[PDB]
């Protein structure tokens, strides 16, 4: 049910961003810091999305891609739309029309070098690493930067979870 | 349905959580006469019996208390040792307490430690190709069901042997896991989870399943 | 989700627990976050959910802002309100639901105080922005409870307009 | 789709024989070390239960299961061990192994004068009789109690 109002999550995210801008002077640091906290988000987001549904591990990339879009539509209540595959089908792009986190906030012009909603890229990273799966994700387009809608990249460079659940660890 | 114990372990395989659901070990007392047919053997802090498991005193029943006076590892409370107490005749006829060693927590840690490889080495050189490991290990008077998180953590619990419909219960304990790791994702595998709030939520899952309802997924 | 908010808030607490050294200033930092929330939510809900019309008088605004803020935050108004005669400045607003337990709570050894203070911070923001500077304490008494210390000029002001 | 394989181990932990039918995952380990590893593992599980048992384990260990195959164990009070691999789900096979012991082994091994005690069986009759007793119910699946 989510039992919570979208604006309240947006206000908590704005509290984070403003507090980072204060505590640390530079956008690069606050961004890498939030990417770390999002990495640590993912280590619980992915296990939750598994507790809601034991999805298959991986036979192909787009299977993971629609798994994660399902998850994004779960907690953010917003249906994403996968697109832009590799010729090698390894990497795709992810589309959010309007993030409750990203939206209800615009950006003062001084912070152009800031990448705002990068908490989600961190989320994806940590989510894929607790699931022992090696991927690179960055928002190729972000709603705030003048892009139509937030666009990501999802570069699944290699594997860390094997076919038997013994795995390498 | 009665659950003897509940457990979860980490990528390390270390025992992260070992709540026990109160399953006592059997006890026996009997007014012992001249040297006892129980074959008492000293083995390295254990004062046990090796043979003649009579009257419901199993072989593994470690001496627990002597004549009401407690007995500690090899000797007794008062300083007497089991040997000196025993082989002195005229003390007899006497009572001796006996029961099984509730493996002190540390020993349970060791047990989980040694078990982890069996999980990870459940004949990884299997017959069946590209196989998958252990999930269900039945035993004499308990049965082990594990739920791999399908990536990472292991979920093993100890239930009454003759039972089905427990893997969904494992899924629900997985849900409790998610609930708690929401607390602090920094509060990670490295430290063990001993946070009494989530823990009484688990004991309420226990409370529900002690009663009839394990259908009625209500936790 | 519920649990996404619980996770984002765990990262809240952890970021504090990182670049904050001791507990009471961590609660202060939570209180700052709460002020940040209130500072804009109150102006939002002046119109949409508060009859679009301003309300100034103390207890009416207390209870009604309590309720409207809770409906647009969690959709659950605070369960009770106490205003105490023995100290007319001392009022208690008490809600059995802690915002914190979306993720069930912290170690019970190091930090006596929790998000309860961050919600109290949002409370302080809305009160002081309505026209009611106040200091709020969160206590683990009868569940998540609060206590409000209004402003002296304010307390005299309404004590005077107790009549019209 | 007959059984994968079948193992024997003395009360001293030595591999007596291994007969394979349908095991496919081609082993990186030469079979002897694998048999040693399995005997040690089974011993470990015996200790494992005998400690963590709520009460008397009269027969102790029974078997373990995977999602995609399964295995079962038989204990002989003399200390010989019986292990075979089966599929996950069909009738139990604890009894089938008891029968194989009490008939095939007690007949075509110990009642063989030219099998010296405590060695590898190499009887073509014990081999062929094992083949036929397995071909009795080439059943794959266990769901053992």
Q: Give the 3-state secondary structure of residue C80.
A: strand
Q: Which of these, D38, D41, D46, lies nearest to D62 by C-alpha position?
A: D46
**Which residues of D are less than 8 Å from B23 in CB distance?**
54
Cβ atoms of A52 and B175 closer than 8 Å: no
Task: For residues B191 and B88, state if they share a domain.
Answer: no
Quote the Cα angle for C62-C66-C72, to 5°: 145
> What residues have CB less than 8 Å from C11, skipping those under 6 apart?
A16, A37, A38, A40, A41, B185
Nearest chain B CA: its distance from D140 CA (Å): 12
Contact B150/D at CB under 8 A = no
Report the alpha-carbon distance of residue C131 to residue C127 in Å, rounded. Answer: 6
With CB atoms and an 8 Å threshold, state whether B118 touches D41: yes
Report the alpha-carbon distance of residue D93 to residue D63 in Å, rounded. Answer: 10
Q: Give the 3-state secondary structure of residue D14.
A: coil
Joined together, the tokens standing for residue D62 give 């029974």
For chain A, how many structural domains are there in total?
Answer: 1
Report the alpha-carbon distance of residue A157 to residue A161 in Å, rounded. Answer: 13
Cβ atoms of D129 and D111 closer than 8 Å: no
Q: Around Cβ D107, how many Cβ atoms within 10 Å?
A: 13
**Which residues of B are less than 8 Å from C7 in CB distance?**
182, 185
**Domain region containing B12:** 1-24+103-219
Task: For residues B84 and B132, state if they share a domain.
Answer: no
**Domain region containing D73:** 1-145
**Which residues of A are less than 8 Å from C99 in CB distance?**
none
> What residues have CB less than 8 Å from D110, skipping those under 6 apart?
none
For chain B, how many structural domains are there in total?
Answer: 2
Nearest chain B CA: its distance from A164 CA (Å): 5
Joined together, the tokens standing for residue B8 give 């979860």
Task: Determine the angle formed by the axes of helices C23-47 and A6-23, rounding to 10 degrees.
Answer: 130
With CB atoms and an 8 Å threshold, state whether C103 touches B195: no
* CA torsion angle B107 B113 B118 B121 (round to 10): -160
Task: For residues B112 and B209, state if they share a domain.
Answer: yes
DSSP annotation of D103: I
**Which residues of C are less than 8 Å from B178 in CB distance?**
3
Contact C110/B at CB under 8 A = no
Cβ atoms of B58 and B100 closer than 8 Å: yes
In order, the DSSP letters of chain A are: ---S-HHHHHHHHHHHHHHHHHHSS-HHHHHHHHHHHHHHHHHHHHHHHHHH------SSHHHHHHHHHHHHHHHS------B---TTSSEEB-EES--TTTSS----GGGTT--GGGHHHHHHHHHHHHTTEEEEEEEEE-GGGT-SSEEEEEEEEEE-S-SSTT---
Pairing of strands A91-92, A150-159: antiparallel
Report the alpha-carbon distance of residue C131 to residue C65 in Å, rounded. Answer: 13
Contact C5/A at CB under 8 A = yes
With CB atoms and an 8 Å threshold, state whether B151 touches A51: no
Domain end (from B102, B125, B141)? B102
Joined together, the tokens standing for residue B208 give 């529900």
Task: For residues B160 and B208, state if they share a domain.
Answer: yes
Give the DSSP H or E segment for C32.
Answer: helix C23-47
Cβ atoms of A46 and B177 closer than 8 Å: no
Using CB atoms, pick whichever of D23, D48, D58 lies closest to residue B127: D23
**Residue C74, preceding peptide bond in cis (omega within 30° of 0):** no
In order, the DSSP letters of chain B are: --EEEEEEE-TT--EEE--B---PPPEEEEEE-SS-SS-EEEETTEEEE-S---TT--TT-EEEEETTEEEETTEESSS-BHHHHHH-STT-SEEEEEE-----HHHHHHHHHHHHHHHHTS-SS-SSTT---EEEEE-SS-EEEEEE-SSS-EEEEEE-SS----HHHHHHHHHHHHHHHTT-TTS-TTS----HHHHHHHHHHHHHHHSS-SSS---
Cβ atoms of C139 and C53 closer than 8 Å: no
Task: For residues B57 and B8, state if they share a domain.
Answer: no
Q: Write down which chains contact chain B via at least 3 CB pairs under 8 A.
A: A, C, D
Sign of the Cα torsion B215, C2, C8, C10 reads: negative
How does C69-88 read in b/e, with b if 16+ C-beta sit within 10 Å?
A: bbebbbeebbeebebeeeee
**Which residues of C are less than 8 Å from A3 in CB distance?**
2, 74-75
In the sheet with B143-148, reading across from the earlier edge strand, the strands are B15-17, B3-9, B154-159, B143-148, B134-138, D63-66, D70-75, D81-86, D5-9, D15-20
Joined together, the tokens standing for residue C111 give 């930090």
Joined together, the tokens standing for residue B2 give 């009665």
Pairing of strands B27-32, B94-99: antiparallel
Distances (CA, A) of C94 to C97, C131, C145, C157: 9, 21, 4, 25
Q: Give the 3-state secondary structure of residue D71.
A: strand
Q: Around Cβ B152, how many Cβ atoms within 10 Å?
A: 20
Report the alpha-carbon distance of residue C83 to residue C60 in Å, rounded. Answer: 12
**Up-side HSE of residue C121: CA atoms within 13 Å toward CB?**
22
C-alpha radius of gyration, chain D, whole number? 15
Contact B137/D at CB under 8 A = yes
* CA torsion angle C148 C154 C159 C164 (round to 10): -130
Task: For residues B94 and B118, state if they share a domain.
Answer: no
Cβ atoms of B98 and B63 closer than 8 Å: yes
Joined together, the tokens standing for residue B51 give 């043979």
Cβ atoms of B9 and B16 closer than 8 Å: yes
With CB atoms and an 8 Å threshold, state whether B185 touches A44: yes
Using CB atoms, pick whichever of A7, A16, A18 lies closest to residue C12: A16
Q: How was this structure determined?
A: cryo-EM
Let me know if A72 is exposed, middle or buried by CB neighbors in 10 A (0-12, 13-18, 19+): buried
With CB atoms and an 8 Å threshold, state whether B196 touches C104: no
**Domain region containing A135:** 1-169
* Owner of token pair 């090899």: B74
The residues of A whose Cβ lies within 8 A of any Cβ of C are: 1-5, 7-9, 11-16, 18-19, 23, 33, 37-38, 40-41, 44-45, 48, 74-76
Cβ atoms of D9 and D39 closer than 8 Å: yes
* Owner of token pair 């809608």: A149
Resolution in A: 4.0
Contact B211/A at CB under 8 A = no
Pairing of strands C90-94, C144-149: antiparallel
With CB atoms and an 8 Å threshold, state whether A12 touches C37: yes
HEC profile for B156-190?
A: EEEECCCCCCCHHHHHHHHHHHHHHHCCCCCCCCC
Give the DSSP H or E segment for C79.
Answer: none
Q: Around Cβ C123, how many Cβ atoms within 10 Å?
A: 27
Domain end (from B102, B126, B157)? B102
With CB atoms and an 8 Å threshold, state whether B184 touches C105: no
Cβ atoms of C10 and C101 closer than 8 Å: no
**Any idea how long chain A is?**
169
Q: Write down which chains contact chain A via at least 3 CB pairs under 8 A.
A: B, C
Task: For residues B78 and B166, state if they share a domain.
Answer: no
Task: For residues B141 and B160, state if they share a domain.
Answer: yes
Give the DSSP H or E segment for D8.
Answer: strand D5-9
Closest CA in chain D for residue B117: D41
- CA D26 to centroid of chain Cα atoms: 19
* Owner of token pair 């989700």: C1
Task: For residues B190 and B115, state if they share a domain.
Answer: yes
Closest CA in chain C for residue A1: C1
C-alpha radius of gyration, chain B, whole number? 22
For chain D, how many structural domains are there in total?
Answer: 1
Cβ atoms of A137 and A154 closer than 8 Å: yes
**Which residues of C are less than 8 Å from B179 in CB distance?**
3, 103-104
Q: Around Cβ C127, how many Cβ atoms within 10 Å?
A: 24
Report the alpha-carbon distance of residue C92 to residue B129 in Å, rounded. Answer: 67
Q: Around Cβ B51, how many Cβ atoms within 10 Å?
A: 11
Q: Around Cβ D26, how many Cβ atoms within 10 Å?
A: 7
Sign of the Cα torsion B87, B93, B95, B100 reads: positive
Quote the Cα angle for C84-C88-C94, to 5°: 40
Report the alpha-carbon distance of residue A53 to residue D116 in Å, rounded. Answer: 58
DSSP annotation of C161: T
């Amino acid at each position: 049910a989510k039992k919570v109002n979208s604006e309240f999550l947006t206000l908590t995210y704005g509290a984070l961003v403003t507090q980072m801008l204060r505590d640390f002077e530079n956008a690069e640091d606050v961004n890498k810091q939030l990417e770390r906290i999002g990495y640590n988000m993912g280590m619980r987001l992915i296990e939750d999305f598994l507790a809601r549904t034991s999805a298959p591990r991986c036979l192909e990339m787009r299977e993971t891609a629609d798994r994660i879009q399902q998850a994004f539509r779960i907690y953010l209540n917003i249906q994403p739309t996968i697109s832009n595959w590799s010729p090698a089908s390894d990497e795709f792009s992810l589309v959010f029309d309007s993030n409750p986190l990203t939206e209800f906030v615009e950006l003062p012009p001084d912070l152009t070098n800031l990448r705002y909603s990068a908490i989600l890229s961190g989320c994806i990273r940590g989510a894929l690493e607790m699931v022992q799966l090696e991927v690179q994700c960055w928002f190729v387009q972000d709603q705030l930067k003048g892009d139509n809608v937030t666009e990501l990249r999802v570069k699944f460079v290699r594997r860390l979870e094997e076919v038997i659940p013994a795995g390498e660890d | 349905m009665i659950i003897y114990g509940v457990y979860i372990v980490s990528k390390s395989g270390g025992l992260i959580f070992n709540l026990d659901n109160n399953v006592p070990r059997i006890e026996h007392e009997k007014t012992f006469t001249y040297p006892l047919d129980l074959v008492l053997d000293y083995d390295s802090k254990k004062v046990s019996v090796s043979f003649n498991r009579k009257d419901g005193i199993n072989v593994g029943h470690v001496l627990v208390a002597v004549n009401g006076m407690p007995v500690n590892g090899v000797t007794l409370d008062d300083g007497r040792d089991v040997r000196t107490t025993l082989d002195a005749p005229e003390n007899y006829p006497i009572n001796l307490k006996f029961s099984r060693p509730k493996m002190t927590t540390n020993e349970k840690i060791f047990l989980a430690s040694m078990f982890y490889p069996l999980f990870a080495i459940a004949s990884q050189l299997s017959p069946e190709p590209k196989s998958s490991g252990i999930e269900i290990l039945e035993a004499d008077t308990f049965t082990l069901h594990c739920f791999q998180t399908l990536t990472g953590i292991k979920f093993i619990i100890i239930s009454e042997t003759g039972l089905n419909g427990i893997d969904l219960l494992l899924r629900k304990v997985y849900e409790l896991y998610s609930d708690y790791v929401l607390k602090n994702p920094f509060y990670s595998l490295e430290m063990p989870i001993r946070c009494e709030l989530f823990d009484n939520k688990l004991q309420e899952l226990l409370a529900q399943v002690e009663k009839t309802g394990i259908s009625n997924i209500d936790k | 989700s519920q649990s996404i908010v619980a996770l984002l808030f765990s990262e809240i607490v952890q970021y504090s627990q990182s670049r904050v050294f001791t507990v009471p200033e961590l609660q202060t930092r939570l209180h700052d976050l709460g002020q940040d929330v209130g500072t804009r939510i109150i102006d939002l809900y002046f119109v949409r959910e508060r009859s679009s019309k301003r309300e100034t008088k103390l207890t009416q605004m207390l209870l009604f802002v309590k309720t409207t803020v809770w409906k647009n935050l969690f959709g659950k108004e605070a369960e009770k309100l106490e205003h105490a005669n023995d100290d007319e400045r001392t009022y208690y607003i008490i809600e059995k639901e802690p915002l914190v337990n979306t993720f069930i709570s912290v170690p019970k050894d190091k930090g006596s105080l929790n998000c309860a203070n961050f919600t109290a911070g949002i409370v302080e923001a809305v009160l002081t922005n309505c026209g009611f500077p106040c200091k709020v304490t969160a206590h683990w008494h009868k569940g998540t409870t609060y206590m409000v210390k209004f402003e002296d000029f304010v307390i005299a002001r309404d004590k005077q307009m107790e009549e019209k | 789709m007959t059984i994968f394989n079948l193992y024997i181990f003395d009360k001293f932990g030595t591999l007596l024989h291994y007969a394979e039918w349908n095991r496919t995952k081609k082993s990186g380990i030469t079979r002897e070390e694998e048999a040693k590893l399995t005997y040690g593992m089974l011993f470990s599980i015996k200790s494992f239960v005998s400690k963590i048992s709520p009460h008397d384990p009269k027969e102790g260990f029974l078997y373990y299961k995977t999602n995609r195959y399964a295995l079962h164990y038989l204990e002989t009070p003399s200390g010989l061990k019986f292990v075979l691999n089966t599929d996950t789900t069909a009738i139990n096979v604890k009894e089938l192994l008891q029968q194989l012991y009490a008939k095939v082994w007690v007949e075509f091994v110990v009642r063989d004068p030219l099998w010296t005690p405590g060695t590898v069986v190499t009887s073509e009759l014990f081999q062929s009789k094992l083949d036929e007793f397995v071909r009795q119910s080439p059943i794959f699946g266990i769901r053992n109690i």
